Each structure stands twice: as C-alpha cells, then as structure tokens.
C-alpha cells in the first residue's frame, strides 16, 4: 500500500469533507505538537504524578492463546517491571482511561477541535492511555467510533485496512472477538489465510506530536518501535 497522508492543521471543513465523511485515514501535524504533554511527559514525570496509582496491565505479546493475561499494579511497579529493568515478559498499559483517574494529567492534553464535527457530546469522548515498552503489539482490530490517536513518546508502526477489505482479514467467529482479526499482520499464515496477501492497506510510522485519525471501523494493527506513550480519543 501507500503511506498515510500528512496534512498540517487542515481546516475543519476540509478535514470533514476529504477525510471524516468518506472515512479515510490521515495524519494531522501541527495540531497536538505543542500540547504540554509533548515536552512534559517522561518516566520521571509519569512516576512523579501517577506513580502510586493502580492501573491494569496486559501481560503477553498478544492476546489470542491465554498466555496473555490481565493484571493490576501500580504505575511505579509497571515501569520498574515491564519497562526499566530487563523485563521478563511484555507488559502493556493499554486501553485505560487514565485521565479520568488522574485529572492532573488531563491538563497536559486537549480534545482536538475536529471532534466538534461529530454528532456526539464532548463529555462522552473516551480518552485512553497506551503506555509501554518498545515492542508491544495491538493485533489487527476495529473500533466502534472515530479515533484520534495522539503520539506523545516514541514511534509506532501502524497498518490500516479498510472495512471494505474485511473479507480478507478473517475475523474471529465468536461475536465477542468479532471485531479482531485472526491474522498476524507481520507474519501471516497464508496457508490458512491466503486472501490476506492481496488485500490493500495503508501504513505509517507515527511519531511524537502527530495525530493519526482512524475512521470508524477501520482496521488497524499497531507495534511500538520505542518506549511509547499514545493517547486515544474515541468520539462520534
Ligand atoms: C494490545 N491490546 C490492545 N487492547 C487491549 N490493543 C488495541 C485495542 C483493541 C481493542 N479491541 C479496542 O477496542 O481498541
Ligand atoms: O496499541 C496502540 O497504541 C493502538 C491503540 C488502539 O488500538 C486505538 O487507539 O483504538
Ligand atoms: Zn483500536
């Protein structure tokens, strides 16, 4: 496929018309790049503000066979165990609303203006922290709302497949896992999943300051390339 387009602070109507309404992915630059989080958030500072709080942590590379488990620990324990000291397994602080838990971290972000183009209420926008070492993998999956994924620390390799291509992505049959792909994007078994080979996609390397707009129900797979902190806004 091709690289995801990058636009420097598009006007709202131009984002509405070329991207939101047709549902095409884009990176928005010059938008979140000066938010306080971009210069303020570090291991020192995350420990200082959030260190003693309780967070859920996903342990294991990815979630299919339950090797993957979910646990709870303090942010300090997560940093020390899964990031700093030669971790024994991949832990990921994933899909957690950490800014409703620590309001003082919410002062470091904002809700992007483009969300007001939606039909939903600003109070109901779901804000999720994603924080973990180099190498976390979110398997190919789709989400029920629009998403702004704001990169803060580190880089993420991302791949996007359209809803129109779902027939080549082999979703799990169980309605629980309905929206997750059985395919390992970066090493697909093409004996089992042959149609995955021909399906087109976009990909990118998302970097700090940059916002990736993921259209509703667009499939995405995400691998952190460095120690990484992203913040997702689910809106509608
Ligand atoms: C690696 N782990 C992850 N989540 C637990 N990755 C991305 C979130 C996928 C989830 N189905 C969603 O609703 O976005
Ligand atoms: O693991 C990641 O960073 C991707 C998060 C994600 O899937 C989402 O923003 O909905
Ligand atoms: Zn997602």
Please compute Rg for the chain using Cα positions: 18
Measuring CA to CA, which residue among 91, 71, 99, 189 is closest to residue 133?
A: 91
**63 annotated to bind ligand:** no
Q: For residue 149, give the ligand 2 atom closest to its CA.
A: 9
CA–CA distance, 177 with 217 (Å, rounded to integer): 14
Do 148 and 106 contact (CB within 8 A), yes or no? no
Burial 204-231 (b: 16+ CB within 10 A, else e): bebebbbbbbbbbebbbbbbbeebbbbb
Resolution in A: 2.2
Q: Which residues contact 213 (CB under 8 A, 6 or more apart)?
A: 15, 19, 20, 25, 26, 27, 28, 114, 146, 147, 148
* Probe target for ligand 1 pocket from 68, 89, 92, 95, with the most ligand atoms within 8 Å of CB: 95
Q: Quick one: CA dihedral 138, 231, 83, 38, positive or negative?
A: positive
Burial 25-47 (b: 16+ CB within 10 A, else e): bbbbbebbbebebbeebeeeebe
Backbone φ/ψ region at 121: left (φ over 0), alpha (ψ -120 to 50), beta: beta
**58 annotated to bind ligand:** yes
Beta strands, E only, 121-164: 126-132, 137-141, 146-153, 156-161
CA–CA distance, 83 with 92 (Å, rounded to integer): 9
Report which protein residue has its CA nearest ligand 1's atom 2: 138
Exposed, middle or buried by CB within 10 Å (0-12, 13-18, 19+), for 191? Answer: exposed
Cα of 137 from ligand 1 centre, angstroms = 9
Q: For residue 130, give the ligand 2 atom closest to its CA.
A: 3
Residue 72 pairs in a beta bridge with 56
Structure tokens at 45: 């500072």
Instruction: Tell which CATH architecture fits domain 1-236.
Output: Sandwich (2.60)
Structure tokens at 53: 């709080």
Cα of 144 from ligand 2 centre, angstroms = 13
Start-to-end Cα distance in the chain = 27
Report which protein residue has its CA nearest ligand 2's atom 7: 138
Cα of 138 from ligand 1 centre, angstroms = 6
CA–CA distance, 179 with 203 (Å, rounded to integer): 20
Whether residue 138 has its Cβ less than 6 Å from ligand 1 = yes
3-state secondary structure of 159: strand
Cα of 62 from ligand 1 centre, angstroms = 10
């Amino acid at each position: 496929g091709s690289g995801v387009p990058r636009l420097h602070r598009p006007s709202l109507q131009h984002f509405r018309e070329q991207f939101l309404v047709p549902g095409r992915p884009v990176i928005l630059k010059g938008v979140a790049d000066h938010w306080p989080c971009m210069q303020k958030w570090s291991l020192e500072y995350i420990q200082e503000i959030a260190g003693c709080r309780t967070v859920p942590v996903e342990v294991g590379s990815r979630y299919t066979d339950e090797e993957w488990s979910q646990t709870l620990m303090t942010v300090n324990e997560f940093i020390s165990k899964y990031i700093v000291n030669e971790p024994r397994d991949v832990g990921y602080l994933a899909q957690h609303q950490l800014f409703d838990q620590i309001p003082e971290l919410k002062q470091d972000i904002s809700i992007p203006d483009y969300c007001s183009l939606g039909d939903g209420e600003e109070e109901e926008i779901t804000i999720n922290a994603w924080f973990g070492p180099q190498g976390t993998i979110s398997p190919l999956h789709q989400d029920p709302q629009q998403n702004f994924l704001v990169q803060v620390m580190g880089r993420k390799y991302i791949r996007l497949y359209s809803p129109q291509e779902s027939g080549a992505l082999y979703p799990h049959d169980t309605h629980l896992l309905h929206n997750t792909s059985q395919v390992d994007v970066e090493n697909p078994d093409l004996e089992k999943f042959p149609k995955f080979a021909k399906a087109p996609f976009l990909s990118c390397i998302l970097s700090p300051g940059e916002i990736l707009f993921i259209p509703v129900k667009y499939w995405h797979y995400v691998r952190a390339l460095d120690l990484s902190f992203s913040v997702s806004f689910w809106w509608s």
